[PDB]
Write a protein that binds this ligand. Structure first.
Ligand SMILES: Nc1ncnc2c1ncn2[C@@H]1O[C@H](COP(=O)(O)OP(=O)(O)O)[C@@H](O)[C@H]1O
Ligand SMILES: Nc1ncnc2c1ncn2[C@@H]1O[C@H](COP(=O)(O)OP(=O)(O)O)[C@@H](O)[C@H]1O
Ligand SMILES: [Mg+2]
Ligand SMILES: [Mg+2]
Lengths: 67, 375, 67, 375
């Protein structure tokens, strides 16, 4: 009887391990994907922020020259 | 090891060591600067029984080691500790031999010249690096930002440095070091948590509470009003799940901890907040470029991963300085690696090998040659 | 004695499953946060980009008026 | 009860409760902080059959009661226990009603603010004290010494605190709490006596061995040399007559027990000896006054009745610090009552009733008023 629980737990834990590990692989792949996307988006929003800054200085120059 | 003889790039930042190869985008071996030693003596056998423990090994073995800092605020305790940790980094972590690769190192701002002379001498005797170069982390963070104008706020774990650089030139006359850093943050949080009922002294809880600072801490927009509304604040109060499983709840402390750098009078510093240190730094130099300094301020360091520094920074500087020109901060994500990136940038160009500090120059003029070879 | 060996394997899977569940959870929360950041940062980039475009029309008219 | 409405002065020290009237030189009711409860259930009749036992009653009934500590290192277990012991102190021991006398209380250094808010609230609801004031025992010991400059070493039974105060001003930035105290001393002595052949676990033997510490213990001038000469030491070895009548002989242990505080590595603390904790405390503050701190150190607590702390203290500090200025310790006899004396001193002057914490202030602002009324 002690042995049937041993084996029963072994089988259940083995299948649970497979499911948990496949879940880990997919979670890791999604993490890598989304991290790369986040890095690209951060670079792009840095670009857009500096560009907006550029727009601001040039606008200032235009308004002083017009005055 | 790469087939090419490319250089080593190592940032020995005050709080983290990040090492790797030149031409790489990120350092390969990154570890905190804690060092663990056996808390007791040897009677057992069959395993362990090793003196120095560094890196993730010590992180896993924090509880049975006395955790000591070979460097604190730049001061050097024992060069043997650096010898061992560099051995570990080069061979056990980087899997590289320093014989065939020159090393580019970064040092804390305004580090002692005697410290540089001793560290370089022990390095050259102990190791067999072909060539050398050491630079201040300020210009490295500048290189990471890639803009020659700005004031760098380097917030390490031992010192916070404010350094202005205009059009890629250093301004030592307007550079200052403040003794507030991660250590102070942990200390202050320790005393507040003591007033919350939890009183610990050991370093494991130090790392736990710095992790809490990494996760939950705020930078208060308005201080006394936020404790006034944080009196009850069921929603605003935030909790953490400590690894043992207990739920530890913290409210106003989240934004009352980083505030101490801004408000040093809490634990007794004559120097005012770090924004005052950036302000004075700015006015020390000629008036005209000050506006550009206002608009080109950069912040660097591992602490910068926290929220709230940017908004507080701009608002207080605008309060202190006239609000005509718009002030904006720039801070790329994961900027604690940025210094190391700049090191790679230094090795990128072909002029860098014109001023490698070779072995024979040191053999001729001793360590003193660096006094003429770096600056 | 056979049971000891099987229990050892059972134990190893138990610890591996606990560790796997914790790392799976950490990766999943990390990357869900990363994807939420992806969407939010997309919207931030688009809004700053439209502001930049608007600035460009204004600045064009500004240069015309200056001349 | 005195015809005058003079205030109550109560020192709830971590290890001893000393209560009395204002204007008195010594507390009237002094008892240890142990609390006994019936080890078994009730079947007999005609006498006894009472739950809480406090004071000398529990001291006489130690064997029949599970001996429990309502406070340990500041942490509070059950407020009902304090309720009962305060009832006993006020009515059975002080023969006073708290309705007509405001209370001045002393609390352990850096006690939780939540602890203060809960204890004050339960106090005000349960009791009818007219007015309140609570103060840190550090400034009380300072008042007993009557000198505004010095560093106070408060060695209670749960915590040892080092607190620097210069010209009557607190320095929380340089204040530390160490988890070594009487409990540790008893524990360490318990394990050594276990290695001597006598192994007990119960609290009666805890009190016996702390009595042994009170009577026979040394503070070794030189440690390993004194065990080397204590190998035989027929004269140096000292004996005690336990109340059962057996003669228990102890040699080097007499000076190997307090040494655990001085050398924490014996039972595994990262923190070094308490002299290192006073040293670091001193340097944290500005350099200049440090000499005065060296020359004005004070020690307080019941433990201070032991010999050897003064000589060890001065010698080690002189070893650590430069030996130009002369370091001297001051410690008046029977200084464990000194805190309570300082409480009387507080009630001596006529300005003290300007900041009594009255009932109506607490009724208006709840417990939160103390956050603004004491500090
Ligand atoms: N991922 C992170 N998030 C938040 N804070 C961090 C993170 N990593 C490190 N830190 C903080 O950064 C500090 C180390 O600073 P460091 O980057 O070494 O300074 P420097 O830039 O001078 O090398 C540590 O004390 C730690 O609290
Ligand atoms: N007459 C005495 N001689 C020696 N030690 C004593 C004496 N009375 C009390 N003690 C010790 O003092 C400890 C209690 O310290 P206490 O005075 O309560 O600290 P605090 O000053 O923080 O109130 C007890 O553990 C006991 O061992
Ligand atoms: Mg830094
Ligand atoms: Mg005491």
């Amino acid at each position: 009887k002690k042995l049937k629980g041993t084996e029963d737990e072994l089988d259940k834990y083995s299948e649970a391990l497979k499911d948990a590990q496949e879940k880990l692989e997919l979670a890791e792949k999604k993490a890598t994907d989304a991290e790369a996307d986040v890095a690209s988006l951060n670079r792009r929003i840095q670009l857009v922020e500096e560009e907006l800054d550029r727009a601001q200085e040039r606008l200032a120059t235009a308004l002083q020259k017009l005055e | 090891d790469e087939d090419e003889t490319t250089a080593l790039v190592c940032d020995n930042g005050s709080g983290l060591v990040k090492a790797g190869f030149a031409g790489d985008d990120a350092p390969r071996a990154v570890f905190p600067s804690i060092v663990g030693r056996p808390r007791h003596q040897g009677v057992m056998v069959g395993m362990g029984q090793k003196d120095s423990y560094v890196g993730d090994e010590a992180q896993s073995k924090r509880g049975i080691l006395t955790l000591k800092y070979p460097i604190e605020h730049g001061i050097i305790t024992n060069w043997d500790d650096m010898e061992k940790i560099w051995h570990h980094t080069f061979y056990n972590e980087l899997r590289v031999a320093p014989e065939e690769h020159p090393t580019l190192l970064t040092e804390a701002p305004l580090n002692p010249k005697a410290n540089r002379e001793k560290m370089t001498q022990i390095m050259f005797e102990t190791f067999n690096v072909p060539a050398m170069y050491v630079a201040i982390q300020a210009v490295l963070s500048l290189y990471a930002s890639g803009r020659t104008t700005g004031i760098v706020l380097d917030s390490g774990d031992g010192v916070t440095h404010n350094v202005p650089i205009y059009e890629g030139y250093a301004l030592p006359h307007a550079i200052m070091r403040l003794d507030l850093a991660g250590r102070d943050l942990t200390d202050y949080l320790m005393k507040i948590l003591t007033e919350r009922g939890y009183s610990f002294v050991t370093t494991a809880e130090r790392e736990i509470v710095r992790d809490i600072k990494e996760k939950l801490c705020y930078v208060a927009l308005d201080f006394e009003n936020e404790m006034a509304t944080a009196a009850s604040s069921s929603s605003l109060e935030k909790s953490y799940e400590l690894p043992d499983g207990q739920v530890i709840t913290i409210g106003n402390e989240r934004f009352r901890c980083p505030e101490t750098l801004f408000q040093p009078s809490f634990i007794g510093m004559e120097s005012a907040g770090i924004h005052e240190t950036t302000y004075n730094s700015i006015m020390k130099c000629d008036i005209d470029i000050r506006k550009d300094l206002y608009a080109n301020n950069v912040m660097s360091g591992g602490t910068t991963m926290y929220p709230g520094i940017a908004d507080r920074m701009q608002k207080e500087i605008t309060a202190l300085a006239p609000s005509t020109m718009k002030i904006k901060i720039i801070a790329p994500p994961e900027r604690k690696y940025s210094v190391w990136i700049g090191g790679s940038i230094l090795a990128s160009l072909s002029t860098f090998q014109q001023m490698w500090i070779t072995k024979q120059e040191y053999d001729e003029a001793g360590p003193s040659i660096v006094h003429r070879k770096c600056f």
